[PDB]
Design a protein around this ligand. Structure first.
Ligand SMILES: Nc1ncnc2c1ncn2[C@@H]1O[C@H](COP(=O)(O)OP(=O)(O)O)[C@@H](O)[C@H]1O
Ligand SMILES: [Mg+2]
Length: 535
């Protein structure tokens, strides 16, 4: 298990009660404890799953993310202050880190501690042996669900490669003097192999926290680290679905016709695509049992609901987003019936789907990308949202996050583009762009049409179809696809006139053009401009 002398080596003192490798049954009674107060509390829903509140923090806090700049990360990290693109990798001094470590370790000292040992990465050769230390039971549950649960033999000789101490209950009083964003903090020290959290309870910080570390370590060894969903067909054909938050990675990869490899984080080495996690983190806002049966069915004992509204009788109102629109539910991957096992990996991907939810209603439901359009759109990392739908009218807000996940990038986005291209070319992979977002109808395309589109991409129908070039973006779109409504296939059809579509295509194109300018500092990046939209 674990001794108090080892926890002391970390800096945590007077730990009397230690719960090493808590079981799901223990975690279950821990959360349901009637004498719990505030955010540690869990309630039982009629679906058998416990629901908790993550507190004030209902999403990640990129503004509070810091990485210690020392001789190990100085020349390798994609620093937010080196003027090479917008990122959240703000530098932190070794000195301020020690103060933060003091805060967290002291907060955890003299407390009952949960110690969850787990792996990040399905392969023994590149995975991280992470030890999570926390004082909140549902947080230990979150990481038991989301990371790879070792076997008794792996636990026997478990030597941690990284430690993440969650001091969510403590805050940083010296922040103003230290030049930080607030009293909260999500800091990382690559020299000490540690992550510290304070102020925010949100479990997503640990998840995306180790992802950022994999995003740093893997590409440096020639392995692609990707923000993508992934599944395999019965033939052995692997597909990866890149995309920003809310685009459909989890919704679409969870298809009964294919075996789920993972839903959010994967690597791509010499053998293929491997999952980093041990669970799935599904969105539950307006969740439909009919539209997403497999995900709904996964919600039961051992799944951990978050911020959803639970009525008196224990029933859940999934449509209620008053606490947050980011309602979620984590669960072990095995809660999905059709998955790859025992190990969550498979062969090289041949299909690479870039999902995007276009609030502008410009991009087409699907288009097969050229080799250059693939790189252009990868570095672009576009998606948009109807910000203000609650305050009035549409007003689409664009988001350009490099590699479809800049918030977790620890190296320059070109380092991810390169390793990805090297993997795609060796496997002969093909890339597609899917607009899981909006049309001229002002509505989002149906999940039915979108799934029918994904089938077409995977079974080769999209490749065999006759296509024509959509103007502005110069995207090859099919004239028709099996199971998909033909009208929506061409975005101009959903408007009163193609001129109305044109107006928007022009606005969105300038957004893309302005955003891509920062990559044209190299000859290769200058050449890709030809691949993007053109006025
Ligand atoms: N056509 C569509 N394709 C995918 N998701 C859709 C579609 N229409 C609506 N949605 C909703 O959009 C969200 C996509 O979420 P999810 O797959 O969890 O995003 P990601 O995993 O990329 O964050 C879900 O709430 C889903 O029900
Ligand atoms: Mg997801």
């Amino acid at each position: 298990g674990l001794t108090p002398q080892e926890l002391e080596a970390y800096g945590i003192s007077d730990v009397h009660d230690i719960v090493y490798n808590p079981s799901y049954d223990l975690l279950y009674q821990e959360e349901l404890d009637p004498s719990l107060t505030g955010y540690e509390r869990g309630v039982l829903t009629n679906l058998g799953a416990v629901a908790v509140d993550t507190g004030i923090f209902t999403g990640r806090s990129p503004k509070d993310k810091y990485i210690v700049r020392d001789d190990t990360t100085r020349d390798t990290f994609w620093w937010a202050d080196k003027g090479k693109g917008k990122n959240d990798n703000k530098p932190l001094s070794p000195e301020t880190w020690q103060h933060l470590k003091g805060l967290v370790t002291r907060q955890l000292s003299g407390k009952r501690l949960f110690v969850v040992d787990a792996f990040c990465g399905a392969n023994p050769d590149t995975r991280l042996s992470v030890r999570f230390i926390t004082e909140v039971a549902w947080q230990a549950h979150f990481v038991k669900n989301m990371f790879i649960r070792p076997s008794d033999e792996e636990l026997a000789g478990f030597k941690p490669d990284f430690i993440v101490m969650n001091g969510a209950k403590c805050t940083n009083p010296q922040w103003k003097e230290q030049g930080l964003n607030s009293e909260n903090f999500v800091a990382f020290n690559l020299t000490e192999r540690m992550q510290l959290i304070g102020g925010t309870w949100y479990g997503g910080e640990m998840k995306k926290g180790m992802f950022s570390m994999m995003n740093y370590l893997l590409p440096l060894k020639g392995i692609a680290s990707m923000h993508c969903s992934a599944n395999v067909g019965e033939k052995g054909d692997v597909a990866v679905f890149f995309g920003l938050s809310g685009t459909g990675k989890t919704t679409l990869s969870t298809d009964p016709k294919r075996r789920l490899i993972g839903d959010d984080e994967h690597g791509w080495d010499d053998d293929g695509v491997f999952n980093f996690e041990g669970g799935c983190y599904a969105k539950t806002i307006k969740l439909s049992k009919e539209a997403e049966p497999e995900i709904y069915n996964a919600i039961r004992r051992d799944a951990l609901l978050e911020n959803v509204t639970v009525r008196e009788d224990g029933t859940i109102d999934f449509d209620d987003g008053s606490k947050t629109e980011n309602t979620r539910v984590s669960y072990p991957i095995y809660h999905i019936d059709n998955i790859v096992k025992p190990v969550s990996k498979a062969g090289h991907a041949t299909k690479v789907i870039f999902l995007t939810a276009d609030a502008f209603g410009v991009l087409p439901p699907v288009s097969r990308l050229t080799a250059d359009q693939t790189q252009y759109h990868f570095l672009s990392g576009f998606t948009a949202k109807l910000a203000g739908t609650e305050r009035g009218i549409t007003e689409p807000t664009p988001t350009f996050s490099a590699c479809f996940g800049a918030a977790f990038l620890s190296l320059h986005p070109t380092q991810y583009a390169e390793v990805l291209v090297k993997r795609m070319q060796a496997a002969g992979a093909q890339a597609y762009l899917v607009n899981t977002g909006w049309n001229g109808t002002g509505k989002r395309i149906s999940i039915k049409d979108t799934r029918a589109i994904i089938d077409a991409i995977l079974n080769g129908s999209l490749d065999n179809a006759e296509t024509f070039t959509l103007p502005m973006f110069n995207l090859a779109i099919p004239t028709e696809l099996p199971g998909v409504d033909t009208k929506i296939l061409d975005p101009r059809n959903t408007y009163a006139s193609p001129e109305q579509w044109q107006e928007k295509a022009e606005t969105l194109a300038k957004l893309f053009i302005d955003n891509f300018d920062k990559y044209t500092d190299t000859p290769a990046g200058a050449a890709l401009v030809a691949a993007g939209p053109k006025l």
